[PDB]
Amino acid sequence: CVQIIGGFFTWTPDGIPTLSNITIRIPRGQLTMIVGQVGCGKSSLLLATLGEMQKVSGAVFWNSNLPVAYASQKPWLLNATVEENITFESPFNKQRYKMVIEACSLQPDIDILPHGDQTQIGERGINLSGGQRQRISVARALYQQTNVVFLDDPFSALDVHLSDHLMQAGILELLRDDKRTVVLVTHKLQYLPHADWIIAMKDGTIQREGTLKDFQRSECQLFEHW
Numbered sequence: 001c002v003q004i005i006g007g008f009f010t011w012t013p014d015g016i017p018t019l020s021n022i023t024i025r026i027p028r029g030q031l032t033m034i035v036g037q038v039g040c041g042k043s044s045l046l047l048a049t050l051g052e053m054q055k056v057s058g059a060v061f062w063n064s065n066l067p068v069a070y071a072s073q074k075p076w077l078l079n080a081t082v083e084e085n086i087t088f089e090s091p092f093n094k095q096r097y098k099m100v101i102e103a104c105s106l107q108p109d110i111d112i113l114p115h116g117d118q119t120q121i122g123e124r125g126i127n128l129s130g131g132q133r134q135r136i137s138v139a140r141a142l143y144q145q146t147n148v149v150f151l152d153d154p155f156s157a158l159d160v161h162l163s164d165h166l167m168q169a170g171i172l173e174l175l176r177d178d179k180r181t182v183v184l185v186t187h188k189l190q191y192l193p194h195a196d197w198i199i200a201m202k203d204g205t206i207q208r209e210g211t212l213k214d215f216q217r218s219e220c221q222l223f224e225h226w
Contacts, residue, residue, distance in 0.1 A: 002026040002148070002181070004049075006058030009204075011044060013054035018044060018204035021058065026181060028147070031174065033192055034185035036201030042185050043073045045201060046152050069146035071154055075133035079122035082106075082113060088140045096143060099176075103169035104139035105162060131157040138166070142173060149177075151184040167191055189224035 002025060009019035018041055026032055034042050047053050049062070050070070062068075077085050083092075086100060101107055109132055113119035119126050121136075128136065134157040141149055155163045171194075174182055184195060192198050193212060200207045200220065208218045215221035 001028045001063050003061035007048065007060055008056035008058055009044060009048035010054035017054060017056045019048060022206055024209060026183060028181045029179045030181055031196040032183045033195045033198040035187065035198050040201040041204040042201055043152060046150055046185060049150060069141045069144050069149040071137050071141050071151045073152045075137045077122045077133055077136060079125060081118050082121050083117035085121055085136055086139050086143055088144060090144060100139045100143045103142065104135045105165050106139060148181045149183060153185055153187045156187060192224060
C-alpha cells in the first residue's frame with residue numbers, strides 16, 4: 001500500500017536535502033530491513049518515512065495522509081505506570097498484555113519494580129535503563145497492534161541473549177501479524193537473512209537494495225557474514 005517515488009529528504013529545510021530521489025515501495029506484508037553505518041541517515045530515513053524531512057521532489061503514499069506504529073531511535077516514555085506506558089492510550093486486554101509482557105521480557109523488570117506494572121516510571125519515577133526503555137517502546141508498539149510497524153534498530157540497546165529474545169519474539173510477532181507489514185530497520189547483519197529485503201545506506205543515500213545474491217554482487221554479503 002505504501003508507495004514512495006523519487007523522494008528527497010533533508011535534515012534541515014534551510015539546506016539541500018541529505019537524501020535525493022529515493023524510490024522504494026513497501027507493500028503490506030513486506031519485511032524490510034534498513035541497514036548501514038551509524039549516522040548514515042537510517043534515523044533520517046525513518047523521519048523521511050514520517051514526513052519529517054524536507055521533500056525537494058517526488059511522490060509519497062503512506063495511506064496515513066488520506067482523509068501507523070513507530071519505534072524511535074531514542075526511547076520516549078510517559079511519566080506514568082509501566083502498565084500505562086504499555087497500553088499507550090488503548091483498552092486493556094490481558095492476553096495481549098500477557099503476550100507483550102512475556103515477549104518483551106518484562107516479567108523480570110516488573111519483578112524488580114516496586115509496584116509491578118503499577119510502578120511509576122519515566123520522569124520522577126523509577127529510572128529504567130535504556131534497554132528496558134527500548135523494550136518498553138517495542139512492547140508499546142506490539143500492543144498497539146497497528147497494520148504497519150517501524151522499528152529503528154531495536155536490538156542495539158539489548159544484550160545478545162535479549163537479541164535472541166527480540167529475534168524469537170519478532171518471529172512470533174510477524175506470525176502474530178495477520179498479514180501486516182512490519183518494517184525493521186537494523187544495524188545488525190545477524191538476522192538479515194531472516195527478513196525479506198535489506199536497504200543499505202551510506203552518507204545519507206541508499207547504496208543498494210536487493211537479495212543476498214544481489215548483495216554478493218554488491219560485495220557486501222560476505223562483509224555481512226563477517
